[PDB]
Structures are given as C-alpha cells and as structure tokens.
Amino acid sequence: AAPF
Amino acid sequence: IIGGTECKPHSRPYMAYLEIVTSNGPSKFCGGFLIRRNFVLTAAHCAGRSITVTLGAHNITEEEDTWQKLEVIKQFRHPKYNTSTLHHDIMLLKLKEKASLTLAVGTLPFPSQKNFVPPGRMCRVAGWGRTGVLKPGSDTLQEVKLRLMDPQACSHFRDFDHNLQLCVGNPRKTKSAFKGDSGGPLLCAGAAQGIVSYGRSDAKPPAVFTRISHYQPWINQILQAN
Ligand SMILES: *[C@@H]1O[C@H](CO)[C@@H](O)[C@H](O)[C@H]1NC(C)=O
Ligand SMILES: *[C@@H]1O[C@H](CO)[C@@H](O)[C@H](O)[C@H]1NC(C)=O
Ligand SMILES: [Zn+2]
C-alpha cells in the first residue's frame, strides 16, 4: 500500500 | 493520473494544487478541492510543516491571471488518521483568506446524496500526479474515468475497510489514480463521493479512496468552529  | 487525458483548461474550477513543505526533505505535492471559499479538503497523508495552495491552475509551470496562490494557516487532520493502516486519510486546510470566485476558481459543494453510489458506476478523478510508475508529475491537470468496484476487488489491501473507503478502478484496465493525485475528489453524477488515498506502488488498479459521506459530520464540526 503506497499513499498517493 | 495514469491513462487519463488532459482536462479542458479550468473545466474543474475547484481543483487545488498543493505544495507541501516537510522538514527534512524537498517539497511534496498533492491535489485537493475547494469546498468553501477558505477551505480545501484533501488527504491527511499530504500534511506537512506548511502548505501553499494554488487555485485556478492548469499547467502549473506557467503562471497566468487565473492563479490564486493562498497561504494555509491551519491543517486539520482527522484525529484518528493512522499512518500504518491509512485509515481516516482526510484533512481540512483553512486558507489565510477567502478565494475569489472567478471562471477558473469555484467551490464544490460537499453535496447531499440520497443513496450511496453503486459499484459499476463510472466516476472520474483529476490530478497533476505521475502519469506512470517511473514518470514524473504531470504539468497539466489530467482526468480519467474509473469504475467503482465491489469491495472484494480491494481485498488484497489488508486494511481496506468497505465502510470507510471506496474501491476504484477496473483491474482489467490500466487507468488509475497514482502518486501525487492524493486529495483529488472522485466525482460520480457530478458529486464528490471520495478522495484519492492510496494504491499499489506498481500502479495496478484498483486504488483506495476515502469515502466522504462517512466523515461528513466531522467535516461539518470543523467548518462550524472555524
Ligand atoms: C506547460 O507549460 C510549459 C511552459 O512553462 C511548456 O513548456 C509545456 O510544454 C506545457 N505543457 C503542456 C502539457 O502544455
Ligand atoms: C494504527 O493502527 C494499528 C492497528 O492496525 C495500531 O496497532 C496502532 O497503534 C495505530 N497507531 C496509532 C498511532 O493509532
Ligand atoms: Zn500568515
């Protein structure tokens, strides 16, 4: 999960 | 925005471009949207030491008369925002002054929805984020149409919660929101339903958006006290  | 198309200049007057200053590194950026003349809604993970907002922009490298660069005086992150789970990825920014209403700048009413948006519905999101995994942020505002998915489609995101978030982006397509697009609104039927929050570093859809309806009361609370 990568914060955008 | 991956697999999107450049918007007609100023066709999304509520879009805010955020330049975020952190302490130990170069500046970061995110999207967001004007909900009140002096309030911008965005993602909590976009918080920093200070933030400057640019309204009225299309190509963010070339300044024009439509630009309004506003100072943010206070950042209201959700008190329950969790960095590890990315839950409650929502933040309100209070602007120094109220923006001017022009053909390029305007507010997006944090709505009134009779019923929740059903999966299968096509919505759209815009941003100045990266247009590819190794590609840089876009100079111009890009927009893409994405399909609202059933929560099962996002099961692989172990902390995804159907009640708090939206699953957006057909896995059979490449189109998706990506890094830098955070804080941008997801509009379905002309109403904001979510906020770009997170996804996979390899950009494979779907992505997870914050479900706005769920935070409507907290948003009101903050607005009423400031
Ligand atoms: C954005 O503006 C710059 C000038 O500052 C120009 O060189 C560039 O080609 C423009 N990009 C687009 C996509 O219009
Ligand atoms: C974030 O959530 C995890 C559980 O997923 C919890 O263990 C942790 O303490 C939380 N962190 C904060 C700062 O609340
Ligand atoms: Zn000031």
3-state secondary structure of B223: helix
Q: Which CATH superfamily is domain B1-12+108-213 in?
A: Trypsin-like serine proteases (2.40.10.10)
Pairing between β-strand B165-168 and β-strand B91-95 as defined by DSSP bridges: unpaired
Q: Is the CB of B84 under 6 A from ligand 2?
A: yes
CB atoms near residue B82 (< 10 Å): 12
Token readout for B136 is: 């840089």
Extended beta strands in B22-131, E state: 28-30, 33-36, 39-42, 50-55, 68-77, 91-95, 122-127
CATH of B13-107+214-226, one of 3.30.300.130, 1.10.10.60, 3.40.605.10, 2.40.10.10: 2.40.10.10
Angle at B64 between CA B59 and CA B69, to 5 degrees: 85
Residue type for position B162 = H
Nearest to residue B107, comparing CAs of B193, B33, B183?
B33
Contacts of B199 (CB under 8 A, 6+ apart): A1, A2, A4, B169, B176, B177, B178, B205, B206, B207, B208
Asked if B180 reaches chain A (Cβ–Cβ under 8 Å), the answer is yes
Q: CA of B128: which chain A residue's CA is closest? A: A4
Q: Solved how?
A: X-ray
Q: Which of B30, B158, B199 is opposite residue A2, by nearest beta carbon?
A: B199
* Single-letter amino acid, residue B184: G
Please indicate whether, in this complex, the C-beta atoms of B200 and A4 are within 8 angstroms of each other: no
Q: Closest-CA residue in chain B for A3? A: B198
Residues of chain B with CATH 2.40.10.10: 1-12+108-213, 13-107+214-226
Least Cα distance to B33 among B83, B108, B97 occurs for: B108
